C-alpha cells in the first residue's frame, strides 16, 4: 500500500532526533523543545529502516 | 502449577534414589524457583525440581551436578481435601532440565502431585499413592 505506507511514515519515520536527549522532533526543526538539553541546535534526522 | 506443599528437604538433605539410573542417593544443593531471604535455607517438597549430586553410586554418576525430581516426602503435608499424609522416606529420580528421566523405572509409590506435574515420571511409575 504505497499511499497508506507514506501516510504512516510521516508520523513514525519523518522525524528529527536531538543529539543530546534523543527527543523526537519535527523534520524541519532547528532547536530541540526540551529544557534538559537547553534547547540545543544539534539535531539529526531519524534513521531510515 | 502445584498447590503449596510443606517443605521438608532443605539444602544438604540426602534422599534415596528411586529409579534404576545406577545412583543410590541424592545430595540436594539447590531448589529451582526458590525465593531469597537472609539466612533462610532453600527447601524442596514433593514435585519440585532440584539440583543434586550423587554421593554413592556408579563412578560415572558422581562428582557432577544434575537435576532431580522429588517423588516421596517424609514430612507431612495437607491436601486440599483435608487429609494430612506422609511417606516412609524421601526419594527422588534423576532427570534432565527439560524433565525427562535418566532411567526407565521407578521403585516404590509416587506422590500424586509429582505425577501430575511431570508426564515422564507418571509413565515410569507403577503405583500413584
Amino acid at each position: 500500500e504505497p499511499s497508506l505506507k507514506a501516510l504512516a511514515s510521516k508520523y513514525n519515520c519523518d522525524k528529527s532526533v536531538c543529539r543530546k536527549c534523543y527527543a523526537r522532533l519535527p523534520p524541519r526543526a532547528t532547536n530541540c523543545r526540551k529544557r534538559k538539553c537547553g534547547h540545543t541546535n544539534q539535531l539529526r534526522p531519524k534513521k531510515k529502516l | 502449577t502445584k498447590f503449596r506443599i510443606s517443605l521438608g528437604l532443605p539444602v544438604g538433605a540426602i534422599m534415596n534414589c528411586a529409579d534404576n539410573s545406577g545412583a543410590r542417593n541424592l545430595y540436594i544443593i539447590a531448589v529451582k524457583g526458590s525465593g531469597s531471604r537472609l539466612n533462610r535455607l532453600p527447601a524442596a517438597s514433593l514435585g519440585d525440581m532440584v539440583m543434586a549430586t550423587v554421593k554413592k553410586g556408579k563412578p560415572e554418576l558422581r562428582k557432577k551436578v544434575m537435576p532431580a525430581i522429588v517423588v516421596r516426602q517424609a514430612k507431612s503435608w495437607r491436601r486440599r481435601d483435608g487429609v494430612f499424609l506422609y511417606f516412609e522416606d524421601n526419594a527422588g529420580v534423576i532427570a534432565n532440565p527439560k524433565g525427562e528421566m535418566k532411567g526407565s523405572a521407578i521403585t516404590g509409590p509416587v506422590g500424586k502431585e509429582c505425577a501430575d506435574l511431570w508426564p515422564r515420571v507418571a509413565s515410569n511409575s507403577g503405583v500413584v499413592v
Binding site: E1, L4, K5, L7, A8, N12 | -
Partner: protein, 188 residues
C-alpha cells in the same frame, strides 16, 4: 521593546453574529453557536461595524504581542466553524490483522470501539466528545470521518483515536499499524 500599539482585524461574514463582553466571546452562525473564555490574555476588543472587529494591545512586549495574533486566530476559527464546519478524515493502516472499528453505546456515553489491532485481545474504547459526529464514509475502504463545529473538539477527538493505537515493544518503523489523520478540511 514595549511597542506602543498593535492591532489585528477580524472579518465577520453576513450570517454570523459575534457578542463579546468581559473577554467572553459568543458566535452565532447557521451551523450553531460557540463560546470561549479569554480572561487570560489582557486584550481590548473594539467594533468598527457589523463586518469588522479589531483587537488591540497597548504597551506590550514581545511575548504579549505574540498572543495578540493567537487571539485573532482562535476567534477566526470559531467564526468559520459555525459557517462552514470542520471535517477530519482518518485511514486505517494495517499489514496482516484487519482493524475493526465500530460505534457502541455504553450506558448512554457513545463510545467508539477498536477491535483486532495487531491481533490484540484487548478492547480499546475512545469516548466521543459532545458536538462531534462520526460516520464511516462509503466508496472508500477503511476510512472514518469526524465532523463538528469546534476545531479543537474535532482535532482532539481524532488525536485520541490515533494515540490509542500506538505500537509497543516493537520497531515502529517496520510495524506501521495504526489509525492516522489523512485530511483536514471543511464540511462545506
Amino acid at each position: 521593546m514595549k511597542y506602543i500599539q498593535t492591532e489585528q482585524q477580524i472579518e465577520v461574514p453576513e450570517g454570523v453574529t459575534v457578542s463579546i463582553k468581559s473577554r467572553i466571546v459568543k458566535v452565532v452562525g447557521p451551523r450553531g453557536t460557540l463560546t470561549k473564555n479569554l480572561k487570560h490574555i489582557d486584550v481590548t476588543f473594539t467594533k468598527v461595524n457589523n463586518q469588522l472587529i479589531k483587537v488591540a494591545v497597548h504597551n506590550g512586549g514581545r511575548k504579549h504581542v505574540a498572543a495578540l495574533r493567537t487571539v485573532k486566530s482562535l476567534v477566526d476559527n470559531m467564526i468559520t466553524g459555525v459557517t462552514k464546519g470542520y471535517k477530519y478524515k482518518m485511514r486505517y493502516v494495517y499489514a496482516h490483522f484487519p482493524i475493526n472499528v465500530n460505534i457502541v453505546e455504553k450506558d448512554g456515553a457513545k463510545f467508539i470501539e477498536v477491535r483486532n489491532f495487531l491481533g490484540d485481545k484487548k478492547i480499546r474504547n475512545v469516548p466521543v466528545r459532545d458536538g462531534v459526529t462520526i460516520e464511516f464514509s462509503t466508496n472508500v475502504k477503511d476510512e472514518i470521518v469526524l465532523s463538528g463545529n469546534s476545531v479543537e473538539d474535532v482535532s482532539q477527538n481524532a488525536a485520541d483515536l490515533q494515540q490509542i493505537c500506538r505500537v509497543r515493544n516493537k520497531d515502529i518503523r517496520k510495524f506501521l499499524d495504526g489509525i492516522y489523520v489523512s485530511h483536514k478540511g471543511f464540511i462545506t
